[PDB]
Design a protein around this ligand. Structure first.
Ligand SMILES: CC(=O)N[C@@H]1[C@@H](O)[C@H](O[C@@H]2O[C@H](CO[C@H]3O[C@H](CO)[C@@H](O)[C@H](O)[C@@H]3O)[C@@H](O)[C@H](O[C@H]3O[C@H](CO)[C@@H](O)[C@H](O)[C@@H]3O[C@@H]3O[C@H](CO)[C@@H](O)[C@H](O)[C@H]3NC(C)=O)[C@@H]2O)[C@@H](CO)O[C@H]1O
Ligand SMILES: Nc1nc2c(ncn2[C@@H]2O[C@H](COP(=O)(O)OP(=O)(O)O)[C@@H](O)[C@H]2O)c(=O)[nH]1
Ligand SMILES: Nc1nc2c(ncn2[C@@H]2O[C@H](COP(=O)(O)OP(=O)(O)O)[C@@H](O)[C@H]2O)c(=O)[nH]1
Lengths: 467, 467
């Protein structure tokens, strides 16, 4: 056993104890306070708690690194990426294009870019599970009528032709076993649904993945995103240039303020302070472990009036942003090639950030979060969403398992017994989550710490000839 | 890397987050409450926090065990114990008694048993550091005129004769290099003081000790206590007998309520509820990890009237206590052979307990704490003292090092910069400790989590001839 590992574990153990002493002590005093005097000490209480908590969280990070834990996790996460990408490449490049089995996907989903991109990932996962090579029809793309290869490398190097001796619409893996080319519709109307869907992970990879990653469902998704967004040489250049011109350097926290048409339809308005309290909170955390030259925030928004307001309210923050891209995100100009390349860059610099604050209700932020997973080993915790937790549009039921019994204090809370299956709908970022105890058919609130993630696996193809 | 280790590490990391979310949420609500409504929600808050906190502490225990950590820690602590015990035996048993160098200790220190026993340990440790065999003059012992061998095996099997060609009082290890027999006074008057004192640990053992133990200073002390309290055969039997007769079985929490003459002179009165709130708290922690048939408490006190009061107020508790021993511990009868074996037995069963609640100001509880260290690997945390932190009467200055900067909010608090040496005076068990910033000569309070234990080492004999 490692000496540093033991010293850290004990320091974490003690930090929780001294925190518990501190909580009981100050709360006992708080019960005897009123009005103005109450609020001052309550605020001072929260101030001391923040540092105390971040001190514990810092040691928890150090524990995830000592005695080669960081080095090993980096190596193992590398092999998993290499392994999966190896299989996808093998699958995508058959020797004979005319005789390979193909699954056709059309990009023109009536929605934004992130929603459109996730439809392709959804297509890619099924083709992987069904041992079919992906053919992507991308003409008349609303962001770039030229097609997919306007910005990204083609999904295949040997088989982009869609021909085949038998073609039909999707009817199931078994029924379509003798159809060479299968046309896949969008997931919103898919019938029947196959097992090769989120949030399930490959049977053969689950054990290795959980050992490494804190949310293996996103990593499995991210591997298909990594492959898709292989840039054209000119796109790779534009990224490198924008990086230099914007002064993009670490440490930097990415922020995505989605507004315009999202407000009122799929999400709500969120003031700049709502995002920034978590940025400053995380910057305080980083300062506990490293020298912070400047507090950098890469702002990505479809509200161009925001950047000036952000600079004013936060003078000690260097905001890295391309305000002309924010204008390209406008509604009248959204579906053009220039706006497409703008959001691609915004997502890129968002994913490169050391931390990501946003609303996960927006498809835009979810992509940057997923791409972030391909850049670090187990980057699953490096975010804070203002509303929704992570999901994937069209996923199978996200389920948790109750580990501690809960008795409802109000009618808004549901009771839980250990073993009960809880269908989670989100986290309220206040200690409680909302869901339904499937056992009782009751929907309500419950303590977030009293449940546990139920990881699902699916018997995927392992593509051993890819080695 | 171990799979369970990572799952636990992630759970602990997340559990702290959800606690922080829970804290910020509920505290914001409390700022708008007064009087009865405030205290109701505040007390309900504390209840949720208690369970929430203990869940994290449970995971920390599970983390200290997975992937062979328990087996390895036990083996390494076994080797350390065996090694030290191996070395002590060699020192105490020279072939030629008349020619061996000896350190003579007189047991009749004007104080209680724990203080008297600790005086011998103080004597024993110096004899170890100076490569002298310990000679213990124990006749006219206030507890047993027969001497040390009334209850315990003699410290030596070959050399208990104090004869020697040269004898003199303590003047320092260097000056006494050619004095065969050196008479050691009590630590309260020792001049000059040698380095072989608490809380310093042997140089050659520090690396293995820190890897295993959370407070190696106590473990080093316990090794000399373990050797000393080897029981005479009649005592060894009675120990086994008392176990059966009392129904002593695990799980059990030991409690030591020292009163009578201690109040007003060296400590204060403490109600039974003061002890019992921590028992119930720790039993709830144990209940999270094991089946608890009955809540067992081994009560040890010199107040025999207490057991009735304790049984009354806590009907669902099984109180294991020998009320006649509490009576034998009475003031008029305290210094007799029967009372001696009573406190020896109380200390024994206290050390056997899974947890220890008491006042560390009493020498009695400190012994039970020290003996506990010889029964488990790193049993240093299985306690809660109502007043003093652990100390050893006559120790060199207990020092800590500030690791986080503190700015005084009041005048009662001291400022701290990282690296500052803080001479600690105690822990208030409320988030704050009391001490002196040696750098500034300022004494006051400071957050307990912002400091770190400064471990001290001292070149001690390796005693290779023993292996
Ligand atoms: C050889 C032998 O056994 N000598 C005993 C002698 O040591 C006892 O004195 C007590 O020693 C402890 C420990 O002292 C060490 O650590 C101290 C930390 O400051 C150093 O200053 C010192 O040099 C040693 O390294 C002291 O903590 C005790 O003082 C506490 O209790 C007395 C009352 O008896 C009180 O007046 C003091 O102010 C102090 O109070 C404690 O303070 C802490 C923090 O504020 C509280 O959490 C805790 O509740 C308080 N405890 C109590 C009991 O009030 C002693 O000086 C001596 C015991 O009387 O017996 C000798 O045999
Ligand atoms: N460049 C840029 N474009 C954005 C930003 N926010 C929204 N947009 C545009 O608005 C579209 C929103 O569509 P979508 O990706 O499906 O995600 P949604 O926010 O959940 O509707 C994006 O595709 C962009 O074209 C932003 O921060 N930067
Ligand atoms: N059997 C028994 N004796 C006790 C107990 N508490 C105190 N005594 C007696 O009181 C003495 C106190 O002396 P000492 O060990 O130096 O510790 P201190 O006076 O509490 O600091 C002990 O040695 C016992 O003889 C107890 O709980 N059980």
């Amino acid at each position: 056993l490692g000496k540093d590992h033991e010293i850290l574990r004990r320091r974490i153990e003690n930090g929780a104890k001294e925190l518990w002493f501190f909580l009981q002590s100050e709360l006992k005093k708080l019960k005897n306070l009123e009005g103005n005097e109450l609020q001052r000490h309550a605020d001072e209480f929260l101030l001391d708690l923040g540092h105390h908590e971040r001190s514990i969280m810092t040691d928890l990070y150090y524990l995830s690194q000592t005695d080669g834990a960081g080095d090993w996790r980096e190596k193992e996460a590398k092999d998993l990426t290499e392994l999966v990408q190896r299989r996808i490449t093998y699958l995508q490049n058959p020797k004979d294009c005319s005789k390979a089995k193909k699954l056709v996907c059309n990009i023109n989903k009536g929605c934004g870019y992130g929603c459109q991109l996730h439809h392709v990932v959804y297509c890619f996962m099924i083709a992987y599970g069904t041992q079919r090579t992906l053919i992507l029809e991308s003409q008349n793309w609303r962001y770039a009528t030229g097609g997919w290869e306007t910005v990204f490398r083609p999904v295949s190097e040997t088989c982009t032709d869609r021909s085949g001796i038998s073609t039909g619409h999707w009817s199931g893996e078994v029924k379509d076993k003798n159809v060479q080319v299968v046309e896949l519709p969008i997931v919103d109307s898919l019938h029947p649904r196959p097992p090769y869907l989120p949030l399930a992970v490959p049977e053969d990879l689950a054990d290795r993945l959980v050992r490494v990653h804190g949310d293996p469902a996103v990593w499995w998704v991210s591997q298909f995103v990594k492959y898709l967004i292989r840039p054209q040489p000119w796109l790779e250049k534009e990224i490198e240039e924008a990086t230099k011109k914007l002064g993009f350097k670490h440490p930097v926290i990415g922020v995505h303020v989605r507004r315009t048409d999202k407000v009122g339809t799929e999400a709500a308005f969120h003031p700049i302070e709502e995002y920034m309290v978590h940025v400053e909170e995380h910057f305080q955390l980083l300062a506990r472990r490293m020298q912070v030259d400047k507090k950098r925030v890469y702002l990505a928004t479809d509200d161009p009036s925001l950047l000036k307001e952000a600079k004013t309210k936060y003078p000690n923050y260097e905001f890295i942003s391309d305000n002309s891209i924010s204008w390209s995100a406008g509604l009248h100009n959204r579906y053009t090639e220039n706006s497409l390349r703008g959001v691609i860059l915004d997502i890129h610099f968002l994913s490169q950030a050391d931390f990501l604050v946003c609303t996960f209700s927006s498809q835009v932020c979810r992509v940057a979060y997923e791409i972030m997973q391909t850049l670090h080993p187990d980057a699953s915790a490096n975010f804070h969403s203002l509303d929704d937790i992570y999901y994937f549009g069209g996923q199978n039921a996200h389920n948790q398992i109750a580990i501690y019994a809960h008795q409802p204090r109000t009618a808004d809370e549901i009771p839980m017994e250990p073993g009960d299956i809880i269908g989670v709908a989100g986290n309220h970022w206040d200690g409680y989550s909302k869901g339904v105890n499937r056992k009782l058919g009751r929907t309500g609130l419950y303590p977030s710490y009293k449940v546990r993630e139920k990881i699902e696996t699916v018997k995927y193809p392992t593509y051993p000839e890819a080695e």
